[PDB]
Design a binder for this molecule. Structure first.
Ligand code: CU
Ligand code: CU
Ligand code: CU
Ligand code: CU
Ligand code: CU
Ligand code: CU
Ligand code: CU
Ligand code: CU
Ligand code: CU
Ligand code: CU
Ligand code: CU
Ligand code: CU
Ligand code: CU
Ligand code: CU
Ligand code: CU
Ligand code: ZN
Ligand code: ZN
Ligand code: ZN
Lengths: 300, 300, 301
């Protein structure tokens, strides 16, 4: 058992659009009218090259900038590099990815693999302050050959005082069944530091969020401090050793928690019930609505 | 010939009370009228189960919630899971703990071993904001079989702008003899980020705070940023390579340090001498009083 | 490409002269020669086992001290009022830092070595916590090397001190110059009141002691972005432009208002012919010019 990532090395291509959303927001999407905050999950295998055919449907300039992946200066996505996109414009951005390996100097070159993210560098200031606040950001995952694959992947972005730009106390909530292998990508943006905490679960503070084995000294944690543009990820086995229930995740800064940065990891018994939980309730005047569906990785 | 932790797997039982302390404060204790801030140190061996017979001695509801350990949702310690405790009420809380090992899918399940903590989730808000502010928090240590055991353990909690809820510039101070193996558990709570620093000593930033050997890449540090609910720990040999002295520890955020988050690790020669220490001095109007005794782990 | 240069065994007794002096604008700094003080102060590099005697002289009209992180020192070298190790105006003192290799103790435990990215700063100016001294610029990098550690071509020091980089005016950089392929070391230190996040475009490093993965078994997260707070220090090395190419590669704090307010600089990575595609040097940004690139630091001789 346990599905693992294959070798990379393929040239891949997708479309991405930036568009205005309700109420002053902006998002990236895989099709016109389909933009979401966070933008679509992009998933690659080390060695893969990705050509993103990008179109800006808005009436202001926008760009696409990425952390951690290889790109040439012309793909930086900045005014400074003349890599932004005019209103109505199209540009092809290119991201590349490489495996680890020995350098001739004897050192070991780290590969591209990790939890990363992309966002706008252009809207509102030349640092993307406006774009990021408006919602233009998304997750990118690069797998090393042999990395364990999860059943589903959820993305949690602490953006200023919001989770995924949602109104306070709206979650989101994510559904799983006890035993599911579930991946979280955790990204932070804006002005503030936070601490991400998840009830009833824990992970390894390292590249994959999972210990490699008995020799891995990495601290096991349930709580992690994070600043703007930090990203990390991990996988848990839902309800492992703790059983079903509505398991809270939240920022652990006390006022942030009280002010609505909280959501539920809803872990169901095999029969679909969660012990001791009331679904349609309001919390501080707001309802979390339906659980957010897991993100499907983009294109190909 | 360093002492090491034995294998776990027992069933342990303790009693725990919540009671009001002076000045709007609240604490946990092992006996009525014995509550302390921070609460008693609880120490377990990976695999141990702990039943806590909990009694709420106060006139308002309270709860007990734990990080990192295994527990069922009915032990969550929250209003939402109906696991809180009414005034004058009793409940048994159960915490469980497991060793690392291979799963059936071939992956490696991380153990519970680590530096963790427990606090109230119900007082002042359903996030425990009031309980934590008031002092209901305390350390939990889970040892992996073969972990090095210290001579003594001290707990340092940065709760908002205070150390262990003490008035500004009161320490606490901790006392050791040169060569003692001393363990510190460092927990943060409240609204603020901090950076913990200890003069004259250093530790590995990894699960146990010690390097496993020559193959551990973990950064050796004397300074660590930490946010609300962050938990870590480490051991030092007191005065190693440095000698006796009053060795300051403190938040390194400059104003926090000036405003009183500072204490002393007082390391003595066998004949008692402590260079760089004036025992009768007040600092910014306050005195640290006598050194805090090392916490002895709650007996079963 | 030959095998990288690596640090030898330490164990030598070394000695330098160090001064504190006032600089323009109410600032203060450490220097290797009178009139030569810099912010940050001179880079100090040792090999594990080295002892360093710092013959220190305060040229200022107010007291000052020298305190260090991570390195072995006796209480009389603490550099604090409490330990009576501060220096009076015109005063001199010998500060001694020692350093040790890793190894097994008698108890069978492994003692961690001194090696790492560390720093020194005043502990007595403005308050007994060195709050004024640090604000004014009395701080600098210390590197301790384990035998075998890879040595870079050049080292640069980036200090986020409150809202400034190296106490420079907003939007002035500094910028650092390299050529594609150069092995470039960064020492990154934070001071003052604020948390930040350090980010470098186009490059990445391992979050661990050396900033470099030890091999295929090292689990450390590979990152381009790192949260840091007052007195934090870490370091890494990158191969400039590796897999990416020439360009003006931005580094900045990633807290949005901080980058907007000027904590930004350029890692200027030139092609072998000395040119940078699509970049211009004399621009002003938000009213300020970054001036010429910061020359790399020669470790104190
Ligand atoms: Cu940027
Ligand atoms: Cu928060
Ligand atoms: Cu919790
Ligand atoms: Cu970014
Ligand atoms: Cu409603
Ligand atoms: Cu909680
Ligand atoms: Cu603090
Ligand atoms: Cu220090
Ligand atoms: Cu908590
Ligand atoms: Cu008094
Ligand atoms: Cu200090
Ligand atoms: Cu900043
Ligand atoms: Cu970037
Ligand atoms: Cu310091
Ligand atoms: Cu000018
Ligand atoms: Zn709530
Ligand atoms: Zn003080
Ligand atoms: Zn700018």
């Amino acid at each position: 058992p346990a599905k693992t990532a294959p070798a990379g090395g393929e040239v891949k291509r997708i479309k991405l659009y930036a568009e205005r959303l309700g109420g002053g927001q902006m998002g990236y999407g895989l099709e016109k009218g389909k933009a979401t905050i966070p933008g679509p999950l992009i998933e690659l295998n080390e060695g893969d090259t990705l050509h993103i055919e990008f179109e800006n449907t808005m009436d202001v300039p926008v760009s696409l900038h990425v952390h951690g992946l290889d790109y040439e200066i012309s793909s930086d996505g900045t005014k400074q590099s003349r890599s932004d996109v005019e209103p109505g414009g199209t540009r092809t951005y290119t991201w590349r990815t490489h495996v680890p390996g020995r350098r001739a100097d004897g050192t070991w070159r780290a590969g591209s693999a990790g939890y990363w993210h992309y966002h706008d560098h252009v809207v509102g200031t030349e640092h993307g302050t406006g774009g990021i606040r408006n919602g233009l950001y998304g997750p990118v995952i690069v797998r090393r050959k042999g990395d364990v694959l999860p059943d589903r992947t959820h993305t949690i972005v602490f953006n200023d005082m919001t989770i995924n730009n949602r109104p306070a106390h709206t979650g989101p909530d994510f559904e799983a069944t006890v035993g599911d292998r579930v991946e979280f990508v955790m990204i932070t943006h804006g002005e503030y530091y936070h601490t991400f905490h998840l009830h009833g679960h824990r992970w390894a503070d390292n590249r994959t969020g999972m210990l490699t084995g008995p020799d891995d000294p990495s601290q096991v944690i349930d709580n992690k401090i994070c600043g703007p543009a930090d990203s990390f990820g991990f996988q848990v086995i839902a309800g492992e050793g703790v059983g079903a229930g509505a398991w809270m995740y939240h920022c652990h800064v006390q006022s942030h928690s009280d002010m609505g940065m909280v959501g539920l990891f809803l872990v169901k018994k095999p029969d679909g019930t969660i012990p001791g939980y009331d679904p349609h309730r309001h919390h501080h005047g707001a309802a979390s609505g339906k659980p957010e569906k897991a993100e499907k990785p983009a294109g190909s």
